[PDB]
Ligand binder design. Structure first.
Ligand SMILES: Nc1ncnc2c1ncn2[C@@H]1O[C@H](COP(=O)(O)OP(=O)(O)OC[C@H]2O[C@H](O)[C@H](O)[C@@H]2O)[C@@H](O)[C@H]1O
Ligand SMILES: [Zn+2]
Length: 293
């Protein structure tokens, strides 16, 4: 970690919980009905959906902050550039393709949602993206193929190339990274879209986040606030466990694989990094799912 020293990293290293198989099976069927029936589905993702790609989380038993409390560095089985989207990442791509996902709110800086092919206009990256730099003068973002090279909103060394003055010159503004440091204000645009999506959802589903950061972790509560349903999928306890209508303790890849199977949808294969700015028009709404035995 090349971001500021900071006391309050929240509750780290709590034990993991696994729902027994009968209960897990019933819960994922309930999740499948909810997703199928709801008019406006918002997913909230954190670091737990990228552990299967080899990227450690922050507050899990081997998390970056957990290990830091005992002086150790975390283990990175991949670099950000070489990380591959998980089944969860690709399941979200497909749910968006078939009109079963309205918006995706992510706290992850790992760049995997964009790189999986998920459309940027349905994505809020609340804490940054290691691959994205932004012009300090005109606010244009650049999605790079490789990590921009700084963190904590510093200058990257590159300048903005967007044409200005009838195309007689470039903006030349200073490009800076988008990775927030501790206590930085969230990106205005992304937060406002995320809060709007949550405020108008009838279903919010959280995946692999302990929900300990504010305001990011409080956004799913806005769904519950208007009488919509809240689902939390996580191995550890989360801050907002007491507000969930449905709580699922299991491997997020297991949950999402079973969910897609219940919806009658294939999880597509990833074929290398993409960047999709705007969502395509949806595929046909899938055949009506079969229900639980
Ligand atoms: N395969 C898995 N399946 C289900 N749950 C999992 C899995 N792997 C890990 N978990 C759970 O996944 C959860 C991940 O929780 P946290 O580690 O706090 O990550 P955040 O995304 O909420 O952290 C938010 C910000 O805080 C930081 O400062 C950064 O700025 C972050 O952006 C754990 O509770 C694990 O049990
Ligand atoms: Zn610019």
């Amino acid at each position: 970690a090349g971001l500021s020293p900071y006391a309050d990293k929240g509750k780290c290293g709590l034990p993991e919980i696994f729902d027994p198989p009968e209960e897990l099976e019933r819960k994922v069927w309930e999740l499948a009905r909810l997703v199928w029936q709801s008019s406006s589905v918002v997913f909230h993702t954190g670091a737990g959906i990228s552990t299967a790609s080899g990227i450690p989380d922050f507050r899990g038993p081997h998390g970056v902050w957990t290990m830091e409390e005992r002086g150790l560095a975390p283990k990175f089985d991949t670099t950000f550039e070489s990380a591959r989207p998980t089944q969860t990442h690709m399941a979200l791509v497909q749910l968006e393709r078939v009109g079963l996902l309205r918006f995706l709110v992510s706290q992850n800086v790992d760049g995997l949602h964009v790189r999986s092919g998920f459309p940027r206009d349905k994505l809020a990256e609340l804490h940054g993206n290691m691959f994205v730099e932004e012009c300090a003068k005109c606010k244009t973002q650049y999605v790079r193929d490789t990590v921009v090279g700084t963190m904590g909103l510093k200058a990257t060394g590159r300048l903005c190339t967007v044409a200005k003055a009838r195309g007689l010159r470039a903006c030349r503004g200073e490009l800076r990274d988008t990775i927030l440091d501790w206590e930085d204000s969230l990106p205005d645009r992304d937060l406002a879209l995320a809060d709007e999506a949550s405020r108008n959802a009838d279903l919010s589903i959280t995946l692999g986040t302990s929900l300990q950061i504010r305001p990011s972790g409080n956004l799913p509560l806005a769904t519950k606030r208007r009488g919509g349903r809240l689902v939390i999928v996580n191995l550890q306890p989360t801050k907002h466990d007491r507000h969930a209508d449905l709580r699922i303790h299991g491997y997020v890849d297991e949950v999402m694989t079973r969910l897609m199977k219940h919806l009658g949808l294939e999880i597509p294969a990833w074929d290398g990094p993409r960047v999709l700015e705007r969502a395509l028009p949806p595929l046909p709404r899938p055949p009506t799912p079969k229900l639980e035995p």
